[PDB]
Amino acid sequence: AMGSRVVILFTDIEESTALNERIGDRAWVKLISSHDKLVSDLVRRQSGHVVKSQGDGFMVAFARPEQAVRCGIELQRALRRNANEIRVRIGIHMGRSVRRGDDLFGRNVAMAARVAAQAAGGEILVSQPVRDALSRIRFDDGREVELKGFSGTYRLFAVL
């Protein structure tokens, strides 16, 4: 089979451009640097690696889905603690994808990005394969969506 199994987590900040415009570039560079360090550290704690990041978005790879979910939960908790300003959406999907360079390519990379794009600020959504892989962490009963660039319907599950 083409490619290797990987669990891909995408995250990005809700309305980051408006935030940047509000607080100005000096404050934004500090904010996004602090955020990057936060994400990086929490990823490393779950034996993940940040594959790509640009602006307010990150693509992260894990070997096991429980690591990816644990990382998301800790990130959302950490962001809530900080707020006591920044909300992030998190999406997780797993499947085979092709490593080329220090990037990942293939339909399951794109799918992971769409699972994330479906998530509200403050929310962690996972694809059905992730939910099913973790069925033995708690999930809602899912909602049915259609993902940009893909035919058919997909059920996405919120982490509780």
Tokens representing 17?
């451009």
Q: Which stretch binds Ca ion (CB under 5 A): 15-23, 45-53, 76-84, 100-108?
A: 15-23
Binding mask 23-42 for Ca ion (x = CB under 5 A): --------------------
- 85 Cβ neighbours under 8 A, 6+ residues apart: none
DSSP string, 40-62: HHHHHHTT-EEEEEETTEEEEEE
C-alpha 112 chain-centroid distance:
8
What does 3 interact with, of a copy of itself, Ca ion, none (CB < 5 to 8 A by kind)? a copy of itself
- Out of 12, 43, 71, 86, the residue judged to bind Ca ion by CB under 5 A: 12
56 is in an annotated binding site: yes
The alpha carbon dihedral of 75, 80, 86, 90 has a sign of: positive
- 145 Cβ neighbours under 8 A, 6+ residues apart: 118, 153, 154, 155, 156
12 is in an annotated binding site: yes
Considering the complex, state which of residue 33 and residue 47 has its C-beta at the smaller distance from Ca ion.
33
Across-strand partners of 98?
Answer: 105
What does 2 interact with, of a copy of itself, Ca ion, none (CB < 5 to 8 A by kind)? a copy of itself
Considering the complex, state which of residue 29 and residue 83 has its C-beta at the smaller distance from a copy of itself.
29
Considering the complex, state which of residue 35 and residue 70 has its C-beta at the smaller distance from a copy of itself.
35
Query: Does 110 interact with a copy of itself (rule: CB under 8 A)?
Result: yes
